[PDB]
């Protein structure tokens, strides 16, 4: 069994590289962030452009949605995060404190906290309601490439160019675990939906599936190209059980989670696919690409 993702829409409008796309938890929206300092909102099912959101003074590396689909948070080179009311487009809060640019961000499931990672090598936890920093975690010894809350927000997993992924206890900010054979730069990490495993990408063209409890590597997915960029990967769970990732050869890669076989590659983009995302309920992938492409593609599969 293998999917048949076919192109449905190409979404043009960003004027520099796209850096991150995310579907809203209610499934109705795709949010895109870009080097052009802008967030755009798109309809997930018809591709229809909805609005532009602006205010950051420099480019944006990541974006993420609150669990109720009403808030966005963006991480920018201007060293801030911003909290956005999606309906109105207004910046509700500006999150200041990082001393270098902010690379990655996420809400927790409760959506009362925001986690962020920066080139300043720290992970920060913020209060959504006040916009104030609650904890600064001296998490890494190099830029932090990803941050992610587990299924109930009790844990945060981080990753860095320093070669580590660490798991933090959210309430205390204390480190629980540090997965370590070699230490190539870790360019992305996230928890599985059930929170049992973590998927980590290293800049040696490798994705790995770890058991979080035992700290053991269960699967390795290869054959894509990843040596320069922090590319997003995903668990696809709505149909077949896949791993999905962008790649520096301008393709979207899809693997059988179990057999580790490449089961589909999606042609179309004309530059590095820096970001992919999997719809919460439909077999839909969003992908997006760097400056010589600048577009987002929505893809749909029967399974």
């Amino acid at each position: 069994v293998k999917p048949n993702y076919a192109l449905k829409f190409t979404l043009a409008g960003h004027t520099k590289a796209v850096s991150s796309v995310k579907f809203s938890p209610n499934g109705e929206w795709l949010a895109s962030s870009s080097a052009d300092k802008l967030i755009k909102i798109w309809g997930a099912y018809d591709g229809k452009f909805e609005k532009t959101i602006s205010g950051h003074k420099l480019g944006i590396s990541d974006v993420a949605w609150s669990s109720d689909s009403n808030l966005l948070v963006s991480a920018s080179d201007d060293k801030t995060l911003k909290i956005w009311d999606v309906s109105s487009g207004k910046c509700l809060k500006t999150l200041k404190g990082h001393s270098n640019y902010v690379f990655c961000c996420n809400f927790n499931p409760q959506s009362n906290l925001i986690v962020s990672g920066s080139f300043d090598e720290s992970v920060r936890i913020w209060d959504v309601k006040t916009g104030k920093c609650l904890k600064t975690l001296p998490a890494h010894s190099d830029p932090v490439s990803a941050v992610h809350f587990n299924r109930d927000g009790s844990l945060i997993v981080s990753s860095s160019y320093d070669g580590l992924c660490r798991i933090w206890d959210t309430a205390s900010g204390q480190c629980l675990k540090t997965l370590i054979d070699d230490n190539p730069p870790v360019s992305f990490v996230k928890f599985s939906p059930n929170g049992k495993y973590i998927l980590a990408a290293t800049l040696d063209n490798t994705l790995k599936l770890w058991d979080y409890s035992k700290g053991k590597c269960l699967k390795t997915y290869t054959g894509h190209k990843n040596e320069k960029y922090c590319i997003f990967a995903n668990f696809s769970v709505t149909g077949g059980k896949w791993i999905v990732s962008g790649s520096e050869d301008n393709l979207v890669y899809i693997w059988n989670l179990q057999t580790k076989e490449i089961v589909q590659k999606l042609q179309g983009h004309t530059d590095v696919v820096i970001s992919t995302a999997c719809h919460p309920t439909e077999n839909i992938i969003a992908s997006a690409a760097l400056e010589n492409d600048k577009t987002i593609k929505l893809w749909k599969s029967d399974c």
Partner: peptide, 6 residues
């Protein structure tokens, strides 16, 4: 800055 290499 995610859109930049290395």
């Amino acid at each position: 800055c995610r859109t930049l290499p290395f």
